């Protein structure tokens, strides 16, 4: 149901917050340029892909940065100490393999070791001293990601590192490929630094000054053992999730119901999402300048912020379909 090869390219490219230029940036540019009129990279590194059209100016954002680690110190015996880039849980770093990036397109393996707190965590790269670790290319500031790869789980699901929005990056790439003569001036944006504060979405939205804003991200799917039914949030395979509100934004009620009605009309499976906490790019977009009415479509995902996030292709397809239909009909929307 999804373009597996394309999904693999987007999830496996490195790109931690602030360092998206090391891999994911070029993948997004290469895969979207032939479907838009112009592609530009702004000050902070956001990739802005503009598809000219006659209608409301619409910004669709999917963050391309992923959570990771940064080397803070190299111990006398070669072990590495780290700081989190984004909301990383120490429990997900123990007895795990990592890719320690020594240069663009170059990495060496590392092992995470030693509930665990940050001053107890360290990375072993096989060095015997600080000098050897440095000769291997490691320095204070070296970025690290899990050694994760995309794989299939059963008939419709997948496991991978960084679905937390590389699945949304995949989604906008697919939407850009499907969109044909839409009555709207579209700006697809692969935003930077969402994991550290919705930073890229804030600056790109300011520059674009859209009439309507849309974010595509993952949302909590806690439909797992031991979770009370009312706390599951979303269910895998039950459709794209239309966000009503999360801690960072209360989606415009008119857009929420407009999306719900569009889903019903085109027989696209969907579910309604409400989060007690969490934050998404929409949280920044809607507060741009004099205000921007916004909505958000989310891909349900289990085990978010780990090397083993899980999504369902049926929900991904539903998200691509609903966003495409939204762009084709937004010229009629009356707020």
């Amino acid at each position: 149901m999804v373009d597996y090869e394309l999904l693999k390219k987007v999830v496996e490219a490195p790109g931690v917050s602030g360092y998206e230029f090391l891999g994911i940036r070029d993948v997004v540019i290469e895969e979207i340029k032939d479907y838009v009129d112009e592609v530009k990279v702004d000050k902070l590194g956001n990739v802005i892909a503009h598809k000219k059209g006659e209608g409301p100016k619409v910004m669709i954002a999917a963050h391309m940065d992923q959570i990771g680690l940064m080397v803070t110190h190299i111990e006398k015996n070669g072990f590495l100490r780290v700081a989190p880039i984004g909301g990383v849980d120490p429990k997900t770093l123990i007895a795990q393999r990592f890719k320690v990036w020594i240069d663009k397109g170059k990495f060496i393996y590392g092992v995470g070791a030693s509930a665990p707190d940050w001053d107890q965590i360290f990375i072993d790269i096989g060095a015997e001293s600080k000098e050897e670790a440095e000769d291997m290319g490691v320095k204070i500031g070296t970025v690290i990601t899990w050694d994760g790869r995309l794989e299939r789980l059963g008939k419709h699901r997948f496991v991978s590192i960084a679905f937390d929005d590389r699945i949304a990056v995949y989604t906008i790439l697919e939407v850009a490929k499907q969109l044909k003569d839409a009555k709207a001036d579209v700006y697809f944006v692969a935003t930077v630094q969402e994991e550290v504060g919705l930073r890229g979405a804030r600056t790109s939205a300011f520059g674009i000054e859209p009439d309507y804003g849309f974010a595509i991200d993952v949302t909590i799917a806690a439909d797992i053992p031991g979770t009370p039914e009312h706390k599951q949030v979303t269910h895998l395979g039950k459709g794209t999730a239309i966000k009503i509100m999360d801690r960072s934004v209360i989606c415009h009620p008119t857009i929420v119901r407009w999306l719900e009605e569009l889903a019903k009309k085109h027989e696209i499976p969907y579910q309604l999402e409400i989060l007690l906490g969490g934050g998404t790019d929409a949280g920044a977009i809607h507060l741009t300048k004099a205000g921007v009415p916004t909505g958000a479509l989310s891909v349900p995902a289990r085990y978010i912020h780990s090397n083993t996030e899980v999504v369902d292709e049926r929900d991904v397809d539903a998200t691509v379909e609903l966003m495409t239909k939204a762009l084709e009909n937004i010229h009629e929307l009356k707020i």
């Binding site: 994991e195 504060g197 991200d217 909590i220 934050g279 912020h305």
Partner: peptide, 4 residues
């Protein structure tokens, strides 16, 4: 996903 900030937070989770």
């Amino acid at each position: 996903x900030v937070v989770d």
